[PDB]
């Protein structure tokens, strides 16, 4: 049992894949939302290390990571233990005023105005 190298074809999407997941092959998203959803117990030690490097020690708690190849390379190692979701900014990036009023939704949207009131 040794580390495996996945064929490059796995990470080359198909036209229907873009339709299903609703992601444009151009203007790719910038930030990942990564959550660990399985345990590192009974997994090889290299998988254990990458999980600690990425900060996913606690399960079901989301961490933000750069959508850059070096980060992606580690994520591919632990692809089976995590869920990757594209961070969305419906109302734009938070500013100094809106830093204290943010909330990350389950949908993947970081809203900058969080009122806890009926939409009305």
């Amino acid at each position: 049992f040794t580390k495996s190298r996945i064929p490059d074809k796995v990470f080359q999407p198909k036209p229907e894949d873009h339709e299903k997941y609703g992601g444009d092959p151009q203007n790719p998203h910038k930030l990942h939302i990564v959550t660990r959803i399985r345990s590192t117990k009974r997994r090889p030690y290299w998988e254990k290390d990458t999980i600690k490097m990425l900060g996913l020690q606690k399960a079901h708690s989301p961490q933000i990571h750069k959508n850059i190849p070096s980060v992606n390379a580690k994520l591919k190692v632990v692809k089976h233990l995590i869920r990757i979701q594209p961070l969305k900014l419906p109302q734009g990036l938070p500013t100094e005023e809106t830093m204290s009023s943010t909330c990350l939704k389950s949908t993947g949207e970081l809203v900058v105005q969080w009122h806890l009131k009926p939409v009305e």
Partner: protein, 78 residues
Amino acid sequence: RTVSFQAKESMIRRLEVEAENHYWLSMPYMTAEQECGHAAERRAQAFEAIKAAATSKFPKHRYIADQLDHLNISKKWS
């Protein structure tokens, strides 16, 4: 020995989630060459913090007030 219906359904769910992980990992924002050096400053100062703590170890100050305060144990109402 057959495999339950719970067991086969739950794995397919996990496969579907992992299938999506494949897709989201196929669209890197920055190429490899563009990546070089974009975070050099933060990494440099971060280690300087590590070194500063490591080399700042030293004994603690000792004060007269601590030693002389033990005498208060025999304080009384005169």
